Amino acid sequence: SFSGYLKLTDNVYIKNADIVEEAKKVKPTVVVNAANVYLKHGGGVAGALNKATNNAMQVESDDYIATNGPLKVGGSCVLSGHNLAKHCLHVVGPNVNKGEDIQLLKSAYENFNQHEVLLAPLLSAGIFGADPIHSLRVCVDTVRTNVYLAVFDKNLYDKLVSSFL
Numbered sequence: 717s718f719s720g721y722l723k724l725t726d727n728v729y730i731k732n733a734d735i736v737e738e739a740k741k742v743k744p745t746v747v748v749n750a751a752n753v754y755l756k757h758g759g760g761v762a763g764a765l766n767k768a769t770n771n772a773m774q775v776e777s778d779d780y781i782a783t784n785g786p787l788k789v790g791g792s793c794v795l796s797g798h799n800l801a802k803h804c805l806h807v808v809g810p811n812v813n814k815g816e817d818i819q820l821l822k823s824a825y826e827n828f829n830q831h832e833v834l835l836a837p838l839l840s841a842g843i844f845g846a847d848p849i850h851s852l853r854v855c856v857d858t859v860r861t862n863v864y865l866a867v868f869d870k871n872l873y874d875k876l877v878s879s880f881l
């Protein structure tokens with residue numbers, strides 16, 4: 717199971733780790749992808765997760781979009797986890813660099829409550845442009861299920877832990 721995590725609350729845990737490496741080791745029931753509405757896994761966590769699946773996540777995602785159309789910002793869909801997890805929960809957090817409503821970050825984290833345990837990144841953090849300290853606060857105040865957060869950047873992980881109220 718999950719190891720080396722620091723407990724933040726009753727249900728939120730955090731570790732300085734590469735989420736792809738964490739997914740390969742653990743093979744969680746659910747790995748969360750930091751998706752966009754088009755499921756175009758080009759960069760950040762999405763590009764890294766997709767590259768780990770040898771592009772199978774993108775092929776599956778393109779078929780999903782061809783059938784269903786784009787997701788909503790704040791929404792999600794459950795697809796295969798391929799070689800990383802049983803399932804991948806593709807969650808769309810608001811992209812601040814695209815002028816999207818930061819208030820949608822709470823709606824995005826609410827998707828986690830449909831799963832008892834998840835391996836996840838901080839939503840809207842990184843290339844999505846939101847403040848990761850704000851994302852962690854929304855996570856602990858929204859998610860009630862067991863969430864194991866993987867933060868790739870060591871310096872950011874340290875900042876998040878040392879500033880956690």
Ligand SMILES: NCc1cncc(Br)c1
Nearest residue numbers: 734735736760761764868
């Ligand atoms: N080394 C794979 C990787 C690349 N980029 C971001 C993350 Br998170 C992980």
